[PDB]
């Protein structure tokens, strides 16, 4: 009932990318039906969408007949072409995050930015998070799981996180660009196990990358409940202990000491998932969010975590607000 | 302190596998210090391993040490050679099938034997498992998690699925084959995260291909605790609802149904985690399992079972022996 950090939002329309910079690839949206349109990648319709994902007076009629103050907008994953040449794709971010930026200006108390980088490119990136944090506004950004072959431990990507501790910027981690073919074309399989396999990657890769560790005031929240995570953080610290020839020459602190040190989304549809959740990463870690407005999101907003009879009022309004308040560095 | 599901060994020695069949990329055993052996495929050495992965004595002398009366014996997954040619890898099947029967016969109070099929040959799979029931007397068999391109789905192993229910034969799922190079290559990740969503798509791909649907007296058992899926279960409970186009082409029923239909293994490690599986997967369907002699297994076998303040003395029973006696089919 409160505050939804994870939401995905696109430009009414962009240009043909194709014909901007030279090279196929990219993503386009195609108005074909009233408050319908198509996604595709060179041809290709991949997703088809509502209204409701570019427009933000639709967004707000939705967010009142649900009782959500807030939303924090980031752009759809897809968009987020790490693959392309380092400028390209800086260009693009430039115009997703000038985008964000104007609806927000239009609505500054509904919505919060979470802007887009070139995090294959480390000092166009650094320059892009400067820009969100100092022109446009943003409390945060946007990234995904891996960048091409680095994970998220890579030293190739500390001068970004040293940006966001100094420029105290909050890092919203999305699972993305999952195998998408093979054997996992079927029963909807790279969105319900590649997704929270991805995050459970990144969460590993941070921690025994040492970026915790390295980077104590950085502000991470994982999308998705932490993946397979709380469930699985028994085996990771177990095996971690066991091989620290393979698991600990990075980092040699057990997994187990960065409990309470990232914050996840609540987004796990079961009680019983919320309550081990709340167990394993803490109540003051847990944050409301929804994917709005897609299907595999949260249809009822908030109405998990105020169903739960084992949790206090204060409880359930961390959960719904305050988390994603102290998370975004935001006034109550 | 009971009985174990889950634990492998090999043959003290085989034959030169590429000199049998005719063709290298098998495994091989080398002895090279005492009581100490290397794993190899062609030249390179992949895994160390001690005595008891091969002695049924130092099994026995571990086993009492331990307060374990009964270990299911399976062989090492990478044994499993379904990239073979069919009839080759039948021949090793039978190596390794007649090797764990005579283990077994040697010391029948303490063994039971879970055998290896040339799964992916249905033809030959069913009539290695026949032999193994009916002239073995294994109670039931130990298959991947995928075999090549199939993941578990596939009707062209269901004759498999017939064969087991006629025969009464258990089937214990253990995941194998992960990725093992590019972003897979650090941190133990293969093992820490690829067998637990190895085993989630393998849940997946039988709930929703209809496996449980159309032979509903086959008895399957996933090891390491269901994977993600007692965690993940309503991200992918609710997907299914949302895009039936996605999910249910091949069995309309919500894969929640199924809870109930199909055992885990208890080697998760920690205790909410073990709550939580109980929770999902139910207490009359938990089974423990050790990973002996594997170092990401169970150190002190039972210790979490016994740990757990929740559970009364007859569900720490059920969990520790009396599970396994009814998923194998045996005299309590
Ligand atoms: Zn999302
Ligand atoms: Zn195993």
């Given at each position: 009932?409160?505050?939804?950090?994870?939401?995905?939002?696109?430009?009414?329309?962009?240009?043909?990318?194709?014909?901007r910079f030279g090279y196929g690839g990219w993503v386009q949206l195609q108005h074909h039906s009233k408050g319908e349109a198509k996604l595709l990648k060179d041809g290709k319709v991949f997703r088809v969408v509502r209204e409701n994902c570019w427009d933000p007076e639709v967004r707000?009629?939705?967010?009142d007949q649900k009782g959500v103050t807030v939303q924090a907008?980031?752009?759809?994953p897809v968009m987020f072409s790490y693959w392309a040449k380092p400028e390209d794709t800086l260009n693009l971010c430039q115009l997703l995050n000038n985008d964000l930026a104007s609806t927000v200006v239009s609505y500054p108390r509904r919505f919060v930015g979470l802007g887009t980088l070139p995090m294959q490119a480390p000092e166009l990136a650094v320059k892009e998070m400067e820009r969100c944090v100092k022109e446009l506004g943003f409390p945060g950004v946007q990234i995904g799981t891996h960048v091409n072959e680095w994970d998220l431990n890579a030293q190739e990507l500390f001068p970004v996180y040293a940006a966001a501790e100094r420029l105290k910027c909050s890092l919203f981690v999305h699972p993305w660009d999952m195998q998408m073919d093979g054997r996992?074309?079927?029963?909807?399989?790279?969105?319900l196990v590649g997704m929270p396999a991805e995050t459970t990657i990144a969460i590993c890769s941070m921690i025994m990358g040492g970026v915790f560790e390295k980077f104590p005031k950085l502000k991470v929240c994982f999308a998705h409940g932490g993946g397979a995570f709380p469930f699985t953080v028994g085996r990771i610290s177990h095996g971690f202990s066991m091989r620290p020839d393979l698991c600990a020459q990075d980092?040699?602190?057990?997994?187990?000491?960065?409990?309470?040190?990232?914050?996840?989304?609540?987004?796990?549809?079961?009680?019983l998932s919320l309550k081990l959740l709340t167990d394993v990463i803490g109540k003051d870690k847990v944050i409301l969010g929804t994917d709005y407005p897609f299907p595999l999101g949260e249809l009822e907003p908030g109405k998990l975590i105020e169903?739960?009879?084992?949790?206090?009022?204060?409880?359930?309004?961390?959960?719904?607000a305050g988390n994603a308040l102290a998370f975004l560095g935001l006034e109550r």
């Open positions: 009932m409160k505050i939804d950090i994870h939401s995905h939002i696109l430009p009414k329309e962009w240009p043909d990318l194709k014909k707000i009629r939705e967010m907008l980031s752009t759809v996992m074309a079927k029963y909807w399989l790279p969105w980092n040699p602190m057990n997994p187990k000491k960065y409990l309470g040190s990232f914050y996840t989304d609540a987004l796990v549809h079961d009680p169903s739960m009879e084992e949790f206090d009022e204060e409880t359930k309004n961390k959960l719904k």
